[PDB]
Amino acid sequence: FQSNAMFAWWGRTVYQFRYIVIGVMVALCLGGGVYGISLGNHVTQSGFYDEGSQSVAASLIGDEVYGRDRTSHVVAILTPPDDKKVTDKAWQKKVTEELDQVVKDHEDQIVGWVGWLKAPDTTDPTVSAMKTQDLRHTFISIPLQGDDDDEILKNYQVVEPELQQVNGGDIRLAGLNPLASELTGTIGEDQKRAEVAAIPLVAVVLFFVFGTVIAAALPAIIGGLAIAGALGIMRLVAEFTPVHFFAQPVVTLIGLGIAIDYGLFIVSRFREEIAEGYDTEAAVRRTVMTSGRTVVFSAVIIVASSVPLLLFPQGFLKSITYAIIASVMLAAILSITVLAAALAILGPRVDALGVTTLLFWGRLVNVVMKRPIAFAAPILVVMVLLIIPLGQLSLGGISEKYLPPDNAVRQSQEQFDKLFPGFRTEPLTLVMKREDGEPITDAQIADMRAKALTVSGFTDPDNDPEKMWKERPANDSGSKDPSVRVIQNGLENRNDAAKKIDELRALQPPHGIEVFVGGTPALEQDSIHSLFDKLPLMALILIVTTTVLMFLAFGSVVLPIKAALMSALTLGSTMGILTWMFVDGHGSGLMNYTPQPLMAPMIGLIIAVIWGLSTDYEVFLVSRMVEARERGMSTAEAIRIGTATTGRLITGAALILAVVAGAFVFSDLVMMKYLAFGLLIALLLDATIIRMFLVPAVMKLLGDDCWWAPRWMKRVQEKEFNIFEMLRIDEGLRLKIYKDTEGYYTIGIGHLLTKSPSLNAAKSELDKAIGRNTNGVITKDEAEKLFNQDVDAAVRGILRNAKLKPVYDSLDAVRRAALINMVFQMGETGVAGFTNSLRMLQQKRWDEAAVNLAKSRWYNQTPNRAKRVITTFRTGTWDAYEFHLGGIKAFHHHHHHHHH
Ligand SMILES: CCCCCCCCCCCCO[C@@H]1O[C@H](CO)[C@@H](O[C@H]2O[C@H](CO)[C@@H](O)[C@H](O)[C@H]2O)[C@H](O)[C@H]1O
Ligand SMILES: CCCCCCCCCCCCO[C@@H]1O[C@H](CO)[C@@H](O[C@H]2O[C@H](CO)[C@@H](O)[C@H](O)[C@H]2O)[C@H](O)[C@H]1O
Ligand SMILES: CCCCCCCCCCCCO[C@@H]1O[C@H](CO)[C@@H](O[C@H]2O[C@H](CO)[C@@H](O)[C@H](O)[C@H]2O)[C@H](O)[C@H]1O
Ligand SMILES: CCCCCCCCCCCCO[C@@H]1O[C@H](CO)[C@@H](O[C@H]2O[C@H](CO)[C@@H](O)[C@H](O)[C@H]2O)[C@H](O)[C@H]1O
Ligand SMILES: CCCCCCCCCCCCO[C@@H]1O[C@H](CO)[C@@H](O[C@H]2O[C@H](CO)[C@@H](O)[C@H](O)[C@H]2O)[C@H](O)[C@H]1O
């Protein structure tokens, strides 16, 4: 619990079942990936509104009674080839027959085609308006089949290829479905751009991190298994709840980079351990206990940064939140299962194949350390003046402007609105529902119209307020229930939406009738309102949880307050820049996008994403500084320690992430660029300004005060392993007299009492040793003290031996215990026989000594104990004893049994 206890268990478990683990998980990830390629046909485009808003309710009631509008499904501009005019009866007949053929061949997809071209001899002003007055252009409407927008789009995409060939191909398709097909079509382009531009780029970066093919390929394989598995999970999620189109690229944009970053960290750690002298099995466990632990905790931070998005009612954000959680969790799991097992099978062979086969930063901190205010105050001000273009943001819905200005589908729509003005409308609606269920009378309608005319700001083309707020059209999909009537009118200024909606909702409905104010402006504004109405609580929950987790990771009261400061800074600065780029349009001409109002759900998402990004990177950096301090370093040093060995990893992690996000800034979908850029900025801001400058400078405000909590701080007693626990394993611990392998009476930790066959003689010796009537039984304490005096005796003899005193003096405390261990087992004169091996140890040639000692007869008679001691010589840690193989069936009394 709250301890490496379980990571230690899994670290050794994953090695032991390295074949089973690596087989099952790859099977599941590949199996899921195969199952996850059908996700593309089970995704939705809906989820940008508030399902519980009055505007959505108005739409449901409206569509129920009057029928959903299908006149906007497909709009098609027809233009006669040889500067001919639409009045040409011959041209009229060929095109008409072409249109009838498409409808005849696709009646499951198409309702029919409607337009002036169907009745050129009409007196209808609107129908006659479906042709330009130069008679060079005319448009038709092509209503499609389907009971929801996803089904309708699929029906469009079915008939689109043949529909595009009408009029010799000179037919321009616009409206909802051609635009929706183009907007959702951006997904595949971004995926393919990642698969071709981002993947080899990541491969190169990885190959410049490790000098080896295998070591560089492993993180890439993990990312690929993560994407496959995550998409399979999202496909499973689709069986229960709607999954948005935008969830698929998020898996690749965010999941892939994070997964590879995880793999990079763990493989890198595994190599450290190998180089430190630990064998494969131990290296695997130590990697999981440290890096695996860091990865899992990283996943928790990101999940905790994503969950608050579920407070938002937009299905768009919910799907994405599910996608992030599924990606990050799977990434963390894979890095400590498949990857660990792979390293457990490969071992040092992760560096077997190198480049041949397919072919004082450290004082810079000090500068700012000495000069904290020389760097902090300017940056602290600069990143605030970057927040000032965050006070100038606009919010809108989805339009053709989300596509680049040179996009053919966008331009077709823009030509339609140019050639045929007035046809495209976004009116506010007054949806009236009578509660009794009885018909709504003309008196009640005239009542509502009057109260609507009270509100100003609505269009009036016919210059007569009697012809304002006309009744919504009805089709054959409508129930025509008399208890529901809908009147509607458009705004003169669309930026008056939020205000005019309230005024309409301020009116008083007549005769007990529920009035629902709807329309696309209402849907957008209600969604905008819903998101900022809940943003504070989401922000509170976000900040609190991330701070609470940092209370646990740091053990400080100030540092989490400090990091919150930093994230809120790098957030507001980043979002201020994004607003400067996408709202004000700085960079628009260069990156070929249109300056426009943002989308409110993308703000909630980018807040969570930037926050979790800032928190995760600072936790890893700071947590280590903390470890150095506990290790005994100085405030200024602990910081130096921290920054320097997180350095190469953080930059290597930020870079790979930047590559992936960099592939997505080229997306034709403008909100995708907004997201990908938000990544790059906050990433760059943390990999440099925050980490290398602000943090250390804003860590010097004080020496020893940032580390402070009451006695509600980590105990970290550390059960500092000692020589007592060491030989307790090798020689046993018995509190009652027993016979060892030679049949001699022994007690405690291998302490010979006597060679007499008499038990009472041994009890005699024990009573004189402990200083009381023991009756053959001692306490653990008495055994420990007894053991100590034996250790002192062994040391005195070692220091008395001229063959052992030099090597003993040269050794660290841990390796000294290993030498004492040998003296206990075979005696000083025995240990002094290893003249060459002792010389190697004295020269700190750990590997050579370890190799040489294994060739001994001592290793032959007692391999398990010898390997334990030898490993201790190789690494200089207690690792060989803190985790050892069970058994130890034979106990034997040691040399240097001290007597009173
Ligand atoms: C772990 C890493 C890799 C992840 C890989 C994930 C594998 C995905 C699961 C394997 C395939 C599951 O198969 C799928 O399961 C669900 C069970 O609820 C079934 O779905 C069933 O339950 C839902 C519950 O409302 C019903 O709406 C549905 O009509 C019904 O058929 C699917 O018909 C089946 O096709
Ligand atoms: C992502 C952004 C999406 C952008 C969406 C842009 C789509 C624009 C859709 C334009 C809709 C044009 O739809 C067109 O409207 C007129 C009415 O106004 C219809 O005309 C219909 O109503 C008129 C009178 O109101 C009747 O006299 C006529 O008999 C009838 O056909 C046309 O049959 C239809 O083709
Ligand atoms: C990256 C993949 C993620 C998927 C991206 C989303 C693509 C699908 C949504 C594109 C269109 C947005 O959703 C759509 O917006 C337009 C206006 O905003 C609405 O269209 C409304 O306004 C237009 C004029 O502007 C009217 O002609 C039309 O009668 C009316 O319905 C649609 O009712 C709504 O369905
Ligand atoms: C060890 C294996 C390593 C690789 C494993 C990863 C497998 C998954 C990678 C590809 C993601 C799934 O496959 C993906 O599915 C959808 C539908 O099938 C495709 O995309 C399709 O629908 C999307 C939106 O729904 C459209 O934008 C696109 O025009 C269309 O082609 C993607 O272009 C394809 O990339
Ligand atoms: C601390 C633990 C961290 C790990 C948490 C893992 C995440 C799992 C939490 C799922 C929350 C429950 O998910 C529940 O179903 C859907 C999912 O969109 C939500 O969606 C709700 O509104 C949508 C509109 O889009 C409806 O289609 C849906 O019928 C409705 O349930 C609910 O508001 C939510 O209550």
Ligand SMILES: CCCCCCCCCCCCO[C@@H]1O[C@H](CO)[C@@H](O[C@H]2O[C@H](CO)[C@@H](O)[C@H](O)[C@H]2O)[C@H](O)[C@H]1O
């Ligand atoms: C992690 C920290 C998180 C930060 C905490 C965030 C709390 C900030 C709450 C501010 C509330 C802003 O409130 C919101 O402002 C914008 C304008 O700016 C309004 O938006 C309205 O005005 C703008 C400009 O005229 C229009 O483009 C937009 O279509 C319209 O809806 C919203 O209707 C309103 O709800």
Ligand SMILES: CC(C)=CCC/C(C)=C/CNCCN[C@H]1[C@@H]2C[C@H]3C[C@@H](C2)C[C@@H]1C3
């Ligand atoms: C998607 C939402 C809600 C937030 C963004 C999620 C993102 C990118 C966090 C940044 N952190 C991911 C990789 N971080 C890397 C990992 C390896 C190593 C040690 C840890 C873990 C810290 C660094 C260096």
Ligand SMILES: NC(=O)CN(CC(=O)O)CC(=O)O
């Ligand atoms: N482990 C040892 O020192 C064995 N030595 C024995 C010695 O140094 O006297 C022989 C050797 O190094 O080959």
Ligand SMILES: NC(=O)CN(CC(=O)O)CC(=O)O
């Ligand atoms: N492990 C035992 O029971 C006996 N041991 C001997 C010992 O621990 O001293 C054999 C060995 O370690 O190879």
